[PDB]
């Protein structure tokens, strides 16, 4: 087991063809999960499953610049379930992050922060037991 919140360093930043894989289990009665790809204090890509936002399950994605959140991108496809094991894969492509959950494409998030090699850490937080967090080049 890994302790949450967990920081995964991304040495030399992200780059196209880098694949990040996160394995864990959603806690029973979970409320939220978050992945935060950080450029210093900025959050280049925040991926935030919300299990009960006005009795709806939604994934909210955004960017934080100078401590301000931007325009939300929302996805109603919601592949996570309380109590159950998941796999998140984030593939860096030239123009977006591509996210798959449990081997099924979920969403893409266009790069707003364009200095990819300065996005040097991934934070993993929220209502999970974390099994593994790693990266490889494809
Ligand atoms: C309903 N709601 N949600 C938000 C913010 O909406 C953002 C996305 O647009 C982020 O999700 C942010 N957030 C979430 C977490 C967070 C932490 C700990 C774990 Br553990 C974990 F899983 C996590 F998601 N930290 N910051 C969240 O607080 N805000 C919000 C709140 C403030 Cl004070 C200012 C601006 C906003 C808004 F502009 F974005 F809307 C509202 S109101
Ligand atoms: Cl939240």
From Swiss-Prot:
Sequence motif Nuclear export signal, location on chain? 114-129
Q: Which UniProt keywords apply?
A: Acetylation, Cytoplasm, Differentiation, Disulfide bond, IgE-binding protein, Immunity, Innate immunity, Lectin, mRNA processing, mRNA splicing, Nucleus, Phosphoprotein, Repeat, Secreted, Spliceosome
Please list the residues that carry the modification Phosphoserine. 76
Where would you find this protein in the cell? Cytoplasm; Nucleus; Secreted
GO cellular component terms, alphabetically, are: cell surface; collagen-containing extracellular matrix; cytoplasm; cytosol; extracellular exosome; extracellular region; extracellular space; ficolin-1-rich granule membrane
- GO BP field: eosinophil chemotaxis; epithelial cell differentiation; innate immune response; macrophage chemotaxis; monocyte chemotaxis; mononuclear cell migration; mRNA processing; negative regulation of endocytosis
**From which domain of life does this come?**
Eukaryota
Q: Galectin domain: from which residue to which, for each copy?
A: 6-136
* Subunit organization: Probably forms homo- or heterodimers. Interacts with DMBT1. Interacts with CD6 and ALCAM. Forms a complex with the ITGA3, ITGB1 and CSPG4. Interacts with LGALS3BP, LYPD3, ZFTRAF1 and UACA. Interacts with TRIM16; this interaction mediates autophagy of damage endomembranes. Interacts with cargo receptor TMED10; the interaction mediates the translocation from the cytoplasm into the ERGIC (endoplasmic reticulum-Golgi intermediate compartment) and thereby secretion.
Protein known as: Galectin-3
Q: Which residues of the full protein are shown?
A: 113 to 250 of 250
């Amino acid at each position: 087991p890994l302790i949450v919140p967990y920081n995964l360093p991304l040495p030399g930043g992200v780059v196209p063809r880098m694949l990040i894989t996160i394995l864990g289990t959603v806690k029973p009665n979970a409320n939220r999960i978050a992945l935060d790809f950080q450029r210093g204090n900025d959050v280049a890509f925040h991926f935030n499953p919300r299990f009960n936002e006005n009795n709806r399950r939604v994934i909210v994605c955004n960017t934080k610049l100078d401590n301000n959140w931007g325009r939300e991108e929302r996805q109603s496809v919601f592949p996570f379930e309380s109590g159950k094991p998941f796999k998140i894969q984030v593939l860096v492509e030239p123009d977006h992050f591509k996210v798959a959950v449990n081997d099924a494409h979920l969403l893409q998030y266009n790069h707003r922060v364009k200095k990819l090699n300065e996005i040097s850490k991934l934070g993993i937080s929220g209502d999970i037991d974390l099994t593994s967090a790693s990266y490889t080049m494809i």
